[PDB]
From a paper:
The E protein is a class II fusion protein and the largest of the structural proteins. It is the main protein responsible for receptor binding and fusion, as well as the major target for neutralizing antibodies. The prM protein is a precursor that is cleaved by the host cell protease furin into mature M protein and a pr peptide.
We designed a chimeric virus based on the infectious clone of LGTV, replacing the prM protein and the ecto-E protein with those of TBEV strain 93/783 (24). We determined the structures of LGTV and chimeric LGTVT:prME using cryogenic electron microscopy (cryo-EM) and three-dimensional image reconstruction. The electron micrographs of virus preparations contained mainly intact spherical virions with a size of ~50 nm in diameter, along with some broken particles. We generated a 3.22 Å resolution map of LGTVT:prME and a 3.82 Å resolution map of LGTV. The new models included two extra residues in the C-terminus of the E protein (residues 495 and 496), and the LGTVT:prME model has one more residue in the C-terminus of the M protein (residue 75). Both structures are consistent with those of TBEV, with the root mean square deviation (RMSD) of Cα atoms across protein chains below 0.7 Å for the E proteins and below 1.5 Å for the M proteins. The ordered lipid head groups are also present in similar positions; hence, there are no major structural rearrangements in the chimeric virus compared to the TBEV Kuutsalo-14 isolate. Mass spectrometry analysis of LGTVT:prME confirmed the presence of N-linked glycosylation at position Asn154 of the E-protein. The TBEV strain 93/783 that was used to generate the chimeric virus has an unusual amino acid substitution on the surface of the E protein (Ala83Thr), which is a putative site for O-linked glycosylation; however, we did not detect O-linked glycosylation of TBEV prM or E ectodomains in viruses produced in A549 Mavs-/- cells or in primary murine neurons. Furthermore, no corresponding densities were observed in the structural reconstructions.
Residue numbers in the entry:
A (entry chain A), C (entry chain B), E (entry chain C): 1 to 496
B (entry chain D), D (entry chain E), F (entry chain F): 1 to 75
């Protein structure tokens, strides 16, 4: 089960009558479906990519300059001008020089000077934007059935199945050998917002930087740099990397403001990283609402014989998974195809089984089996597999587990926002009240304070709440105090 | 001259590597305290004059935080 | 006269029997000194320099990284360790990765991981501070007489003589040819404060930047870069240009904070430019207080005959110099060594020659002569040279003259500060209170506010004035109103 | 990460060249006019709410001279 | 006597001891000088000109457009780009055309289009501005003696002498034949302000327009047309005469705003004419100040005998000059040369001669003479030339004369400004007050309101009077009523 | 001699081209917004004489809304 490898895992429970479940699958997340009378499934979003996205602007971070020229004319002899002043690829400044008899002139007064210099990008110093096409993006979802067999993060699982989703694909079925089939739908038009996000590429050859960054469109479209579009020969913005020295009588020096790579990298502080792989451009943060159906599944081996209780020996003894579960691996020397007699009990009360298994109906098979996972109550327990026994102390409390699910909810609602209400095996009427009130009151904060900085949001919220303490009417005082509380509450989670 | 303003710190989806951690309290607190350690005479004059002159603890505290957070910011 | 070439000219004059004048001489300034019956003389400061000044700190603008290694340990196996944590020139971070059976540990939990990288500067990417020594600084003063000839900005003039001043050599006598002798006393006190001033060198080789900057010492000590002193092999604080990625199982990523992450552009905006020339490190904004003795100067040619009045023709007809003076040049034919009979007159009465000659007793010699500079009263005049005569119209008014001299006065005061009072053909008692008030008030303002930005100095001045209006005590109120208005005025007073 | 302050405008002297000449009075007054012409709805809200909440032209102007000039750290 | 040919003529007078007269001489004006016992002279300014003044701007009145090209791109395919955007002598605009399936695009939306066209001026459709150089202007002043012979306009008088004044001159002396020498000094500075005049030229070969116009310099630099200086091959601001159609899918029209000649000739309504003659560029507008000295003038024919009273006959009978003088011509049959016994009487006493002659000591020469001009008092008179007698009823009155001489003074004050106070043969205290009040109060009006339109000036004056009536303070009320009246009077005194 | 006044927006073929498209409202609003930035000091005389002479905010606003719209008809 892939869900044990990752630091991030979730459990969705399908009680009888749950033929379908709605998930918000995420990069850097992973979900288990546990269903009443059906095998447990791993489900996760494994990639979001396009092959060769469309180029937008190229910017230049470091100017190369060459062939500087200057021309000047005496006071009253009319303005100076030069051939390169109307060509491409050239920056020019027109300015007034103080002149007089000492500088070979007829009169004392302000003359005219014009200065010119060619401009280019240094060979590897570009910044390139790329943009996604919703008709060519690929979302990849994977599923792996709880075979009761354990594999490392660096080796293959034979039962792992892939679905690749585009706008051109409907509800798709994955066969799983003896477990039946799983039937799966991905809403590609309802994942990442491809209109507002851009992928930024500097030089992929640099050994000690990430290969791409993800940026917002209305940040990328108004940087103050030289810019271009693909295949054009000349740079196309009023030049910001070149500057002109104060004019002497017959000469004017031209300056280069240097490589901007560092002030770009310092301005990108806080953005998600992305990745590039030969020709594929990958997002590394993102999600899709996806609907998974279960009526076509079966438990394997429900007709098989029981095991010889006496013939079990451990291969990896019980330890804690970090997800509030116990994990183990057994081994058996009898005739192999059979059902493992797993049970667990509260210490001093041998009658009541308390094993809530995460792998329903465990088995041994001719080429595998023997991994088990279970959740047990707090305190002292005995775990059994036939005549093997081991004594376990389960850390935590019932309050601690309710707090953990509470924390994990606020985390997803903070990271994903409005779509976090759609996660679950249910869609009852309260979820419409939740999603509506989130959309309105969160939409107001996004409309009024979108793009405002974290510190000035706090200072504005604190000042508006403080003014709320002494307003001309208590109706205004309470209304402003409550709104100041909301502004700070939205800011102090993720509204930065 | 070139200027490249800082990207917004929120506005984007998590659960993947960010390039660096944002300015948060960290850059603000270290920039303000590092200015008070240098302009010591003016910082002491400002806090003592404000504390002696203004008519309430709440308006003193408000003005002190405002004058400190607005001092080191210019470029 | 070289004094006609520059826009920032000045004039000061000795009264009847005044043998000595005190000057402040500046880079990019020039002073004509005139006294009754002595040849008019030009004085200027041509250079302030030292050869091979002492290196202070070196800073690194772009870190090369190499030979990265990492080590990591399973949960409860204790902390991971490398040899490289103990060496010089390595940057390292110690951090915790989540671990489990998926990455070959025996327990799920937190491990420990340590990652390292070497640091060095890229081949020409350093910033170097240099500092002046008062025992080895050279100030260079030059003097030129009004020979009555003319020369361009790019012509060698035989009348220019030079004296070099340093702490071991305060006084010198120069032989100005037939014009006699001039005595200069300089000092290395007054002028540039070498305790506050650093010269910043980046790379001399680049085509499109100035070779150095005049940076302040209290700013240069605080650059948040990697740094060292000369000859050291390893960099202090090299962690200022490396950041470490989040730890991922058994691997961790090292990143640069990019190239040129340092001093160019917006940080240095408004800093005066310096120049480097082989071994020499020149300042290019600075001054010295200097005393000139006019005892041993001689007039030329008071024994000559006056010209035969008919035999002149203009070589350069009258033009306005820009300094509120008229310049002209005449050719002559006849017996060679002669006085020129120059005068000018207004329409009110014919006998009164109104021309103040700035070339006193003008002549034609065998090799050349016949340039004149003169000052005239406002309005309509006729200018004469024998039988040549030419109408003229002087701009401005007797009030407009005083506004121009007053602005030049304030422009000396705001740029030089306390030493501006040393400029004068007098040194009487009222100069002592003028210099004393600026010694007190300039020291007070600089002590409290010397590092504060222009905008916060204005906000502080507004706050002091507004607190002065709100104060209940009338003495504290008036003191805050006076000091707040002064703080605003001496913040805003950077020009006229 | 690096922080690298803008040089204080008090070392300058002499008739020689000042590099990029970032002269803060004419620079920031030009910047403020350009910014209040873009932030026009906020500028109208600030001048009107102050005119409605302070007692004289002196105190109205005294707060607006600050409040309309928080923009080198605000937005 | 040229002064009798012209509609404007001023008379100047003086006693024996006056010696010098100060005049302001105007193009199209004339002066007759009538000092006690000196031969009378007619004096006028004939021309103000330069040969080949320097060109300022050239402007184009009729754009020629040619060789248009257009390029366009599908939605999302980036900007359209074309070679002619980066040349001299082209005008270009870019815009977003609508695109879709119906014009061979894959997406419905906004594309990109650019259109380019070449620009030039049609063969004779330029305006050229010319400016004067004060070192090269020639003023021509002419003098004519009252020789007692009549030469008409459009024929040549032998007694005329000419003086050419340029910036290199003082007192000239003209030998007026047997009438001795006249000494004359011109101030070539002041009066006309040569820095504010442009001589505008369109085409000298057009049969039905003036060759040039005296346009103001602040107007000529604000003309919204395409422009260049001499010898350049490309036009600045050529986008002032091209206008571009609304875009279609893959085409965009270029339109020409046509020949602007008629709009310029309408905008010039109210600007004085100027004249071009080979190399010469004349003003036909403006004035000069002269001092004229009478000391060396000689009375002709004081030693001759009287004519025979019986031998005269009329050739032109007494006729009204239109200048309050009587003009007549006589023919004589006696011995020559000789003096004409001319006198006139009122009916009240035959002994008192009342003829104030303009021609002093009239004579008959061997080959000329016999014309007399005189002024007579109001009423009924008899004119005698020996035995010839003719009655004369003199029109007008003593109060009417005071009015006409006052009225012509107001014409000098409005047409000439402050120079009106310099016209006269002697000083008097009120002239010193008059020039001060005029230069102060006219200086204030020209400073505060100078360039404002005529109707706006009247509206502001009426608004000032309305404020004077409605505002409650009596000191401000009276100040507004007085100043509004002065503003209205000076406005109506220049007209529209 | 010849004078030709340009006619009002009476004839309006709804969906064909408009030649130079000199549409008066958006043109005159652009002219006013340019005039108050080019001649920016003159509005101080206009607002102060109205604010000093007229006896209500309603009548002060009523004349300024007209006068500042008329102003660019003259120079
Ligand atoms: C109170 C704790 C309720 C159970 C829980 O822990 O509820 C949380 C959800 O409520 C919260 O975060 C609010 C906690 C307020 C305290 C975990 O719900 P979940 O893990 O299924 O996340 C998705 C759950 N939607 C679909 C309902 C959003
Ligand atoms: C009352 C309105 C609640 C809206 C809401 O539940 O707000 C929360 C924000 O909670 C907080 O920061 C406070 C969290 C701690 C409690 C989610 O919504 P969001 O708009 O921040 O979306 C998430 C951000 N994206 C739009 C960029 C994906
Ligand atoms: C022109 C009339 C003096 C103008 C002026 O304000 O001149 C000022 C001096 O007077 C003032 O009141 C200064 C007031 C501010 C302190 C500058 O005089 P200065 O340019 O000759 O510099 C040398 C001036 N020493 C000879 C007195 C040193
Ligand atoms: C009115 C004052 C006119 C003179 C002036 O403007 O004198 C200025 C400012 O006024 C005052 O101090 C007024 C009080 C003293 C007189 C003198 O001080 P400063 O601005 O040259 O500063 C000191 C020079 N540093 C900036 C180079 C260190
Ligand atoms: C308008 C077209 C005028 C054409 C013409 O003929 O212009 C001339 C030149 O106008 C001017 O000098 C106007 C000067 C404006 C200042 C008509 O005036 P004027 O030649 O008799 O000169 C004025 C003769 N006062 C002095 C005897 C009246
Ligand atoms: C009566 C018509 C002539 C007015 C005139 O000659 O008015 C002024 C005369 O100068 C004054 O000082 C009048 C003072 C009145 C008191 C000049 O004309 P202007 O300023 O209206 O036009 C620009 C100048 N031009 C016409 C020569 C191109």
């Amino acid at each position: 089960s892939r869900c044990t490898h990752l630091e991030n895992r979730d459990f969705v429970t399908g009680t009888q009558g749950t033929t379908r479940v709605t998930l918000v699958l995420e990069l850097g997340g992973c979900v288990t479906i546990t269903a009443e009378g059906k095998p447990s499934m791993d489900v996760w979003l494994d990639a979001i990519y396009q092959e060769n996205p469309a180029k937008t602007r190229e910017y230049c971070l470091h100017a190369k300059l060459s062939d500087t020229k200057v021309a000047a004319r005496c006071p009253t002899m009319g303005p100076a001008t030069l051939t390169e002043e109307h060509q491409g690829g050239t920056v020019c400044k027109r300015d007034q020089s103080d002149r007089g008899w000492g500088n070979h002139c007829g009169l004392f007064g302000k003359g005219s000077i014009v200065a010119c210099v060619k401009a280019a990008c240094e060979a590897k110093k570009k910044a390139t934007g790329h943009v996604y096409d919703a008709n060519k993006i690929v979302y990849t979802v994977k599923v792996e059935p709880h075979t009761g067999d354990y594999v490392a993060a660096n080796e293959t699982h034979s039962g792992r199945k892939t679905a690749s989703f585009t706008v051109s694909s409907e509800k798709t079925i994955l066969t799983m050998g003896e477990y039946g089939d799983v039937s799966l739908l991905c809403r590609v038009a309802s994942g990442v917002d491809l209109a507002q996000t851009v992928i930024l590429e500097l030089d992929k050859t640099v050994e000690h930087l990430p290969t791409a960054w993800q940026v917002h469109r209305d940040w990328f479209n108004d940087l103050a740099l030289p810019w271009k579009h693909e295949g054009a020969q000349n740079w196309n913005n009023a030049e910001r990397l070149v500057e002109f020295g104060a004019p002497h009588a017959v000469k004017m020096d031209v300056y280069n403001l240097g490589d901007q790579t560092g002030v770009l990298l310092k301005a990108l502080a806080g953005v998600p990283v992305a990745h590039i792989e030969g020709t594929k451009y990958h997002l590394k943060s993102g999600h899709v609402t996806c609907e998974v159906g279960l009526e076509k599944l079966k438990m394997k081996g429900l007709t098989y014989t029981m095991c010889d209780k006496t013939k079990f020996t451990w291969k990896r003894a019980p330890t804690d998974s970090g997800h509030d579960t116990v994990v183990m691996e057994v081994t058996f020397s009898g005739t192999k195809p059979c059902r493992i007699p797993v049970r667990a009990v509260a210490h001093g009360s041998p009658d009541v089984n308390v094993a809530m298994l995460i792998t329903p109906n465990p088995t041994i098979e001719n080429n595998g089996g023997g991994f088990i996972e279970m959740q047990l109550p707090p305190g002292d327990n005995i775990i059994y597999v036939g005549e093997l026994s081991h004594q376990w102390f389960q850390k935590g409390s019932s309050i601690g587990r309710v707090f953990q699910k509470t924390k994990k909810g606020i985390e997803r609602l903070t990271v994903i926002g409005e779509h976090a209400w759609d996660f679950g095996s249910a869609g009852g009427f309260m979820t419409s009240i939740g999603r509506a009130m989130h959309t309105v009151l969160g939409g107001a904060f996004n409309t009024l304070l979108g793009g405002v900085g974290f510190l000035p949001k706090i200072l504005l919220g604190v000042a508006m709440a403080w003014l709320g303490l002494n307003m001309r009417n208590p109706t205004l005082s309470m209304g402003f105090l409550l709104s100041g509380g909301l502004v700070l509450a939205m800011t102090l989670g993720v509204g930065a | 001259s070139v200027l490249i303003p800082s990207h917004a710190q929120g506005e984007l989806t998590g659960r993947g590597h960010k390039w660096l951690e944002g300015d948060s309290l960290r850059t603000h607190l270290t920039r303000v305290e590092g200015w008070v350690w240098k302009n010591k005479l003016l910082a002491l004059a400002m806090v003592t004059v404000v504390w002696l002159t203004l008519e309430s603890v709440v308006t003193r505290v408000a003005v002190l935080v405002v004058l400190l957070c607005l001092a080191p910011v210019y470029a």
